[PDB]
């Protein structure tokens, strides 16, 4: 229907793809973070702010993604067709849920704004030639200067 | 965490299972009345209620099972397995996008309190045992079935 | 140029979609419903409204295709394509315009708003399975569900 | 009763699993730094902070098993399963113990908000793929790196 | 005609003239750039500012050697000198749109007066040798020397 | 990124496209009229307007065309090929800077509106078929 899932957020997929693939966390680490911080507003009844909303929504479309895979094991003979559909699902839909898992937790934890004056931050500093950047990689911080 | 899709929006995955699985409309209807109905909020850049934002994650996750009905497709050369998971895309895994389909665009319409009682009443009809059972079932509308507006 | 007939009037193509084929009164029918009714606001110098002004171009299209249906027969020495041609401008065609013609004649009769909300609770009672909806369509209609007229 | 031990304050399992088990120094030198820090306060009568309960409770529960990794050593006369034992306790079991001083310990120090949010800030800087991670690793400290006091 | 497209904006061909070939981005990071930040501000009806207007112009002609050099690929027989036009356009003329385009995307994320002194500074320090300078050279950049983002 | 280079000036690609690729002026003449017109302005240190920003693009753009076009002929044996690409630089190209020359000048010397109304106008005139088409085309003037 034409729908960009990042622009009621106030980003665009361009915005998420101008950070490398290779950056984002592994779908793993991003729910565990996502169950230890947010666990019981994912759960509450209350909607609490549309990141929640948002990535509640996340969580179970990669859960029917997993039920699949889990399913492609079983239900599928063939072992080249069978793994062929398995590294699909965790590679390339991976991909796009786990930019999608990070932008919302980075919302929660760091704030919309941040995150967004980040991926237009980090993405500046990786295309700068080394001699003429700062020389560590930007990163997001909750814990304050001493 | 477990997360059940509807209790944010006062329902739960058991009031909802009031409905059989074959009540529901298929994704194509599903996805015609959106766009009818809500496309250019569903479009636009700002969060109008939580229903338009939980139905555009919705609209985008199936629109990425079918770029992978469509990959598996060209990319599966053995016909069987392929033909299993277009299947199991298609119907297994269209089933709980057309129970999510129908519930925020039914929301959207109607109001979330109207699809609330609507369950309940549908509920207290289909466990009717069909001797007793009257024959119109209860429907959403914002209408009576016979509308005589004259003028 | 993806021009949507019914956009301007606060409808779609999709809105109008769920009316059955069968819902729709002939062409005839609905071009005598315009003259025994709207004829002299339609053959008038003003403009009226816009359904006026829609209505009048769907009636001048379809008699340009009733002067190609009779070209047709007179023209064509085959009899295979002759008929085949003038099945598929009175049936093919005629659905588009039998939509047209009633979409216009009913917001003139019924208002506009009260033709939108009708489609609305039609396409909810015609997308449900027939085991759950009541028997009987909603109905728009001017008349009491009696039909008797006092006063 | 399932029973987090870091939900009193304000944490779970799962956020002290962001940091990996090998991150946590050694029960010794825990140990030293609560001694060298709490130790008054420790062995004082009063209640000072449920930081300092929980963190008494750990401090004395880990005397306990090295009463144990002693008494094994007497009494066990298979060196086989007598290893087996004491490389458990000192090891398996150790790991939980040093997860735990770590946090209280931390939390005296530095304060626990921001123990918390070292939690999370460690945690995006742990899951950055190596390409893109930064150098300096968050660390809780009260002083910048290159502290100039002057006088 | 004698223009310097840099001095309508405060610059100079030799103010810009002492940064090295290396210190500025590919053309391919600089239109990722343009686009992952200014997009719809450069696709918009509106003049915006001359750096939009600018970096339009820029935008565009590039595109235009980029369909040279595709057509250089397919229309020369000669393999000599089809690699001798396509290295000409990707280098030569790459390094003045990289030039030019890093200097209006810098000013519009800058502003122009900090780019303009920046580039001041950094000549001082390319004109000194290498003996007589501090080995980093000056930085233009959004980012605390540190990199790490709060708030 | 599309980029009409157009848009921010009221009209598009599709507009422009009203006006046959022989309708405009050579490099040339275009450049010469730039040239005594506005060369005072477009070497000043100001933004005038937005048509002399974007029109000091395109003689700079040119003239990279026109190092190139030189360097191909210095650096480039095999005529042929020589042939192929300086004449492709001259024609090819050339017609997306004197549709973009044309219409900068225009704007600045009849006003723009005035340049968008010319455009509008001369599409009815090359759409009429040629036994009702006026012998005089449509022509910008000040005069």
């Not at 793993?28 to 929504?57: G, I, M």
């Not at 559909?85 to 849920?97: A, C, D, I, P, Q």
Request: aromatic share 12%; with cysteine; hydrophobic share 40%.
């Amino acid at each position: 229907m034409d729908i960009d899932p990042y622009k009621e957020f106030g980003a665009t997929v361009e915005l998420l793809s101008f950070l490398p693939s290779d950056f984002f966390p592994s779908v793993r680490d991003l729910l565990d973070t996502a169950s230890a911080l947010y666990r019981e507003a994912l759960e509450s009844p209350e909607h609490c702010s549309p990141h929640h909303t948002a990535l509640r929504q996340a969580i179970l479309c990669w859960g029917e993604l997993m039920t699949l895979a889990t399913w492609v094991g079983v239900n599928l003979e063939d072992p080249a067709s069978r793994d062929l559909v398995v590294s699909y699902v965790n590679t390339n839909m991976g991909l796009k849920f786990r930019q999608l898992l990070w932008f919302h937790i980075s919302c929660l934890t760091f704030g919309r704004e941040t995150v967004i004056e980040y991926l237009v931050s980090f993405g500046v500093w990786i295309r700068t030639p080394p001699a003429y950047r700062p020389p560590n990689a930007p990163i997001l911080s909750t814990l304050p200067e001493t």
